[PDB]
Amino acid sequence: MLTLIQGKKIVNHLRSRLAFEYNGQLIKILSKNIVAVGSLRREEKMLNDVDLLIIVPEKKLLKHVLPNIRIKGLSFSVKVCGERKCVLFIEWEKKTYQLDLFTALAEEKPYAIFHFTGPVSYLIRIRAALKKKNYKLNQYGLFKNQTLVPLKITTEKELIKELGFTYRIPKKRL
DNA sequence: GGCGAAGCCGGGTGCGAAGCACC
Ligand SMILES: Nc1nc2c(ncn2[C@H]2C[C@H](O)[C@@H](COP(=O)(O)OP(=O)(O)OP(=O)(O)O)O2)c(=O)[nH]1
Numbered sequence A: 001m002l003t004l005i006q007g008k009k010i011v012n013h014l015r016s017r018l019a020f021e022y023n024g025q026l027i028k029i030l031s032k033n034i035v036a037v038g039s040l041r042r043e044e045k046m047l048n049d050v051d052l053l054i055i056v057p058e059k060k061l062l063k064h065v066l067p068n069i070r071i072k073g074l075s076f077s078v079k080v081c082g083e084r085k086c087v088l089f090i091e092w093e094k095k096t097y098q099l100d101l102f103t104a105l106a107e108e109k110p111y112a113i114f115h116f117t118g119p120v121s122y123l124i125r126i127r128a129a130l131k132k133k134n135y136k137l138n139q140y141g142l143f144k145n146q147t148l149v150p151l152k153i154t155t156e157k158e159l160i161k162e163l164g165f166t167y168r169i170p171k172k173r174l
Numbered sequence B: 001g002g003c004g005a006a007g008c009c010g011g012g013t014g015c016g017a018a019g020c021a022c023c
Helices: A004-017 A109-117 A120-131 A156-163
Strands: A018-022 A025-029 A034-038 A048-058 A069-071 A076-083 A083-090 A094-101 A103-105 A136-138 A139-143 A146-148
Touching: A004 A018, A004 A025, A004 A034, A004 A048, A004 A094, A018 A136, A034 A109, A069 A156, A076 A094, A076 A120, A109 A120, A109 A156, A120 A136
Parallel strands: A048 A103
Antiparallel strands: A018 A025, A018 A069, A034 A048, A076 A083, A083 A094, A136 A139, A139 A146
């Protein structure tokens, strides 16, 4: 497996050096539009897979990062994942790892963070628990009888206090 | 089976044969 320092280093590398294609040209990606996801946030001592969160604030460029996102001078294979997820194979130091990224709207950030930070069952439990509150909670926002309702916050306690739930630490397992 | 507002159970797509399998 990999190590925290390496994860942090690659995270730093990705945090200070990413890049993406743009209408035939290329644009670099730095820290403010990038967040980390993985064992580090869950606090694991064994790094299986280290992920990241990359959201776009612009409504158009949101889909401009989607085209071709990459780094300068490395081994990487990027394919589509799931529905609209990004599956990357990364090779460096003669080593290849599997990175599953996701790029979404900056407003999805809290929900995204919440969804991405803990466990599916909690997510579903939370989803149903919340749905049963007569509201459907998805990356996009809150859906009500096919109606769409967006978020008003940008933070975690904010999101929990926004929906009306408590923040449970992964280590407690739901 | 377990549940905070009553009756409920994520969201979808890349394929391979429209049905299964991952994030
Ligand atoms: N694999 C998987 N990921 C899901 C699911 N639902 C939501 N996600 C999220 C979790 C992450 O935000 C992203 C998947 O990342 P990974 O495959 O690396 O797993 P995750 O990061 O949750 O665990 P980790 O801390 O990296 O070992 O999609 C699901 O059902 N399966």
